[PDB]
Design a protein around this ligand. Structure first.
Ligand SMILES: Nc1nc2c(ncn2[C@@H]2O[C@H](COP(=O)(O)OP(=O)(O)O)[C@@H](O)[C@H]2O)c(=O)[nH]1
Ligand SMILES: [Mg+2]
Length: 365
């Protein structure tokens, strides 16, 4: 019966994220690139959660950009004593750059703060700071609690943990399943057979492709349309192929010269080709197998999107001159060929087949 949701705690060091994570688990029970990540699983009445808490700054940066999970929502932990602090802002910004869809706030350490008027002012400030980065600060739920005192079993704080989790259960919706999204299949291989026409293999990323459906071929070249005359696997002929399936798809009236790896098939109009975009990117450290030297405004490495890579030129934001191994940066990119893309799409940066970066499209230009 029970739906799955990926969430995780964000906010400034020491504000209570790890404590809150253990309070939530305690209470609910009673009822290459390296990322340090504590994962816990727990349940409410209505839902199953996979929850990540990170120790270090770098970990949040890397988990957010090059995940593993992808957060359907985040719990912003903020100390009522202190107020929002620099990493409060940084994590809000990152969540916006990478497309964390919803936020719920837990104002923590309310056991250290009598004075209702002060709590309201800290609350108003959290709200404004959320709205600076276009989250709807006026409607976000903010619960006032104490993770410490909830683990001691103190009743009023145990109930604030439940108030949080009720809020999460209601305000953070379940992610749209991939099968209910517009059809999309990145193309891996292309075969021309004289008997049949041209078939493109790959994995359906989303939706359903049905024999007789019409699809666009998007990216690299100009968007052409066609109709699907066949779906297949090794000795099976199928009427359709769905999200997760590896299939060959037979296309009608398509010369082999007119499709290639890196293009996608897609429901007509569902996705458009682009060369220019903004992205948040994490640059790997020497130790992660990345660069050991900085790069600058000209830099022109390979961008890997779905099944292919395209050369692109990187422009740094105003007042950033260099990027070191281990930084994260918002960069603007112009690729030499268009690629089917949307905000939220993740990609790698490589040079000579060696991974130097991981990124996500934050804005299409
Ligand atoms: N007074 C009080 N202290 C807390 C509360 N939650 C956490 N702390 C304390 O603040 C410190 C940092 O908490 P922790 O969960 O490690 O912070 P994190 O870095 O955000 O994960 C620890 O000493 C906690 O015991 C709370 O609800 N009330
Ligand atoms: Mg912690």
């Amino acid at each position: 019966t029970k739906p799955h949701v990926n969430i995780g705690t964000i906010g400034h060091v020491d504000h209570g994220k790890t404590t809150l994570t253990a309070a939530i688990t305690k209470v609910l029970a009673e009822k290459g690139i390296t990322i340090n990540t504590a994962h816990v699983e727990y349940e409410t009445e209505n839902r199953h959660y996979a929850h990540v808490d990170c120790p270090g700054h770098a970990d949040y940066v890397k988990n957010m950009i090059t995940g593993a999970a992808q957060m359907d929502g985040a719990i912003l932990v903020v100390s009522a004593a202190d107020g929002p602090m620099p990493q409060t802002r940084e994590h809000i910004l990152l969540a916006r750059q990478v497309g964390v869809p919803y936020i719920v706030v837990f104002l923590n350490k309310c056991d250290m703060v009598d004075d209702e008027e002060l709590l309201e002012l800290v609350e108003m400030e959290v709200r404004e700071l959320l709205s600076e980065y276009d989250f709807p600060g006026d409607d976000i739920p903010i619960i006032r609690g104490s993770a410490l005192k909830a683990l001691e079993g103190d009743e009023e704080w145990v109930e604030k943990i439940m108030e949080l989790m009720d809020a999460v259960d209601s305000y953070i919706p379940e992610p749209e399943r991939d099968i209910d999204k517009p059809f999309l299949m990145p193309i891996e291989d292309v075969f021309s057979i004289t008997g049949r026409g041209t078939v493109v293999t790959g994995r359906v990323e989303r939706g359903i492709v049905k024999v007789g459906d019409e699809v666009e071929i998007v990216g690299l070249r100009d968007t052409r349309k066609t109709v699907v005359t066949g779906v297949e696997m090794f000795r099976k002929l199928l009427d359709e192929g769905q999200a997760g399936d590896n299939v060959g798809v037979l296309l009608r009236g398509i010369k082999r010269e007119d499709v290639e790896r890196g293009q996608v098939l897609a429901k007509p109009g569902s996705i458009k080709p682009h060369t220019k975009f903004k992205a948040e990117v994490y640059v790997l450290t020497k130790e992660e197998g990345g660069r050991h030297t900085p790069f600058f405004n000209g830099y022109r490495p390979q961008f890997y999107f779905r099944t292919t890579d395209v050369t692109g030129v990187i422009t740094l934001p105003e007042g950033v001159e260099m990027v070191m191994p281990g930084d994260n940066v918002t960069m603007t990119v112009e690729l030499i060929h268009p690629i089917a893309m949307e905000e939220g799409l993740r990609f790698a940066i490589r040079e000579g087949g060696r991974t130097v970066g991981a990124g996500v499209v934050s804005e299409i230009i």
